[PDB]
Amino acid sequence: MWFGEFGGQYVPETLVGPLKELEKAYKRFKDDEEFNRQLNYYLKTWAGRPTPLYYAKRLTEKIGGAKVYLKREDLVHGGAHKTNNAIGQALLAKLMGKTRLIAETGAGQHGVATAMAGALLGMKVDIYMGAEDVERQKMNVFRMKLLGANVIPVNSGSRTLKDAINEALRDWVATFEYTHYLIGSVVGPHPYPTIVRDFQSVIGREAKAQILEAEGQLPDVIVACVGGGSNAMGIFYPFVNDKKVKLVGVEAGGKGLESGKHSASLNAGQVGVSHGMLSYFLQDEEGQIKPSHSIAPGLDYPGVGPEHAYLKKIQRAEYVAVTDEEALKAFHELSRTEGIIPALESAHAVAYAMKLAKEMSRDEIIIVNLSGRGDKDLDIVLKAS
Amino acid sequence: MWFGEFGGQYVPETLVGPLKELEKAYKRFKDDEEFNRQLNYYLKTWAGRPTPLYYAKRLTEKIGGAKVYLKREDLVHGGAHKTNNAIGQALLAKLMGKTRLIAETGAGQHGVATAMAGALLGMKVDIYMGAEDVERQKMNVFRMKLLGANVIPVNSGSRTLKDAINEALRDWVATFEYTHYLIGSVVGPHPYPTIVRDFQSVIGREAKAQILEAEGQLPDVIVACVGGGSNAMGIFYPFVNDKKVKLVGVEAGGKGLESGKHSASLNAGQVGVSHGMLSYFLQDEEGQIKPSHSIAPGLDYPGVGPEHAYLKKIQRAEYVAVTDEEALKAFHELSRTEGIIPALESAHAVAYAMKLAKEMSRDEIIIVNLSGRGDKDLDIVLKA
Ligand SMILES: Cc1ncc(COP(=O)(O)O)c(/C=N/[C@@H](Cc2c[nH]c3ccccc23)C(=O)O)c1O
Ligand SMILES: N[C@@H](Cc1c[nH]c2ccccc12)C(=O)O
Ligand SMILES: N[C@@H](Cc1c[nH]c2ccccc12)C(=O)O
Ligand code: NA
Ligand code: NA
């Protein structure tokens, strides 16, 4: 339910029943061998797990500091880590007798992942997507359509992630007996932050085994970008009890933290309640939720997962921010230097990893979670550069 | 050099020296442990091999006949099988002491794969692309630019793939001292058809081990789309000596075989010499090569690799054609039924497998080479 004080289940009474049924189903199936057999089967043969752990030798030498390994979630079917959670929840939803999936999306990767999982399992998919994100992630909009999903543009508010989430939640309140709300990050009311983290923990379980094979030791640092926090939690979680391993989450610095146009909730937000959870949120002078910004639409959310709020409080993980321009430079850099076009979200992690490697010893090891590929971002990057 | 009567080195004298040097370097490195270790290392950690073999159960049960498996080359880094050949040749070029890679591209996927490989190994990359194709393929050209490759338009001839190869070959005559011409399919003068096939054969070696793991037996049929023929040779080659395994190559039928707007060289073309090889080409009465067409830009080539001409001749493989419309149907079908958006090229193979599966029994097995993903084709399918 809680991570320290953070998390919880602060929802209208209409959603208590559906959430409790989800809790019970998850508790029954999370360690069920047959459930995990089907999940592992799809992750392997359909999604293409395990993903490799790649040594960025050109990038490492160029920077001249620590070794930079990339965990290659960009290679997962769909082009991001989102699929790990999408298939897991869709399978659970099907076991619970649901015939419809709904989901918010910003980058469109979760929308696409959800549409793919829905296609695979013969479930109807409606995706809620901010009107601004419909325009700047158009590639993923047409993928969703071709996969047989309906894309619902959301015109209210900031026309982005938070607004998509409000609309999805309103849908779910009405449609829950046959609709599973397939939330795409470690956010929302319990049990979602736990479920999404658990389904993403495969990233870190693989990476741990892979870095032990490559280097015979655990990494000194793990760097991951933080929108809602799922790819970060996925790669972090298996290392949390390893005392050697520093954990760094990288939030969207936007136009700068003083610009009022960023998504760094942990760095510059206040504790508060929204979307069923106590966590960090960007707030205005009256204490209301204020709109966020990032060039990477997957990071463009005023909130953050409560497990990260907890990791920040106990100082198990450090949270930093990287600006739009810094992220753009890393996007170009990785493409030219390693021949990998990353997602703009992932480019934030690369950007900070390049800063951090520079300051570190050649003996030391950084693992960056390369959460996605950048095909979706080509229009954005074309306009910006 | 030859596959039956097909193949050869039909080039000017200026290219004979470079090809002998390429052949010598390849014979040296092909079976060498160090070359193969480094190649396998990149294929594993950078490209993400092995790719899975996926049982398309929903598609299978919908059609109601044979089991349809998909060899998932769509999951290779870059989104297509081309990467396998790009890494192999780029690495070969690098050990040969070359500092520059050139390549043709039409669809843009090989250009992107060549650009990626050059970025990986720290070599300059110029991609030759016919002017009509530069215009047709905005985003692939942009991908190449982002990877640090220069894209050179070719306004010679019909301003397309055949002309890019000619312009690429013209470049290589002058620059072979420091440049490797990284050819994108099983075409061109020897040793290119053999080299590209060898670097793609991993697809088939994986598929064979994976189908034995999944089903305890070899497939009844393997279906692959054929542009120049590299993904098909890659999956076919390790099965060629398993005589029970039926091999079907699917060419672009376009607007129809009788419309004269297709790229089915094996089906409707005639024997010819072009681009350094003797093989099948769509051509006019003077032996001049005819324009080709396909909705799938990777199949839009008037020729085909000589090893396919050979397999057709000795009847080891059957070659069929699927139309633009049929390929579009399969594209939508696979997306909606399995949640995999295939490349339009690969959709030709899926389309034929769907027809073939209906006439076969459930205890029989079809492997389709899903040569790529459809992210590159979204505008084409939206505009169709
Ligand atoms: C490639 C890639 N990397 C990183 C992220 C950051 O998300 P996380 O921190 O969870 O790893 C995203 C988010 N993509 C989502 C954005 C999103 C969906 N649901 C959310 C809830 C809260 C915050 C963000 C999102 C998408 O719509 O595709 C992504 O697509
Ligand atoms: N503070 C909640 C209030 C709310 C309205 N409708 C909801 C539905 C589900 C959960 C919370 C709500 C929010 O994020 O808007
Ligand atoms: N035209 C496709 C495939 C291709 C590359 N080189 C070829 C040579 C012959 C036939 C097809 C090809 C591309 O550029 O990606
Ligand atoms: Na945030
Ligand atoms: Na052809």
CSV table of C-alpha atoms and ligand atoms in Angstrom, one decimal, chain A residues 10-12 15 166 169-170 173 273-276, ligand 2:
chain,number,residue,atom,x,y,z
A,10,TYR,CA,-7.0,8.0,-2.3
A,11,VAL,CA,-9.8,7.4,-4.7
A,12,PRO,CA,-13.6,7.9,-5.0
A,15,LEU,CA,-13.1,2.6,-7.4
A,166,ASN,CA,-8.0,12.4,-15.7
A,169,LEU,CA,-9.9,7.6,-14.7
A,170,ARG,CA,-13.3,9.0,-15.5
A,173,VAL,CA,-15.2,4.8,-12.9
A,273,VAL,CA,-2.2,14.0,-3.3
A,274,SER,CA,-3.3,13.5,-6.9
A,275,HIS,CA,-4.3,10.5,-9.1
A,276,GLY,CA,-4.9,8.2,-6.1
C,2,LIG,N1,-7.3,14.5,-6.6
C,2,LIG,C1,-7.9,13.6,-7.7
C,2,LIG,C2,-9.4,13.7,-7.6
C,2,LIG,C3,-10.1,12.7,-8.5
C,2,LIG,C4,-11.2,13.0,-9.3
C,2,LIG,N2,-11.6,11.9,-10.0
C,2,LIG,C5,-10.8,10.9,-9.7
C,2,LIG,C6,-10.8,9.5,-10.1
C,2,LIG,C7,-9.9,8.7,-9.6
C,2,LIG,C8,-8.9,9.1,-8.7
C,2,LIG,C9,-8.9,10.4,-8.3
C,2,LIG,C10,-9.8,11.3,-8.8
C,2,LIG,C11,-7.3,13.9,-9.1
C,2,LIG,O1,-6.1,13.5,-9.3
C,2,LIG,O2,-8.0,14.4,-9.9
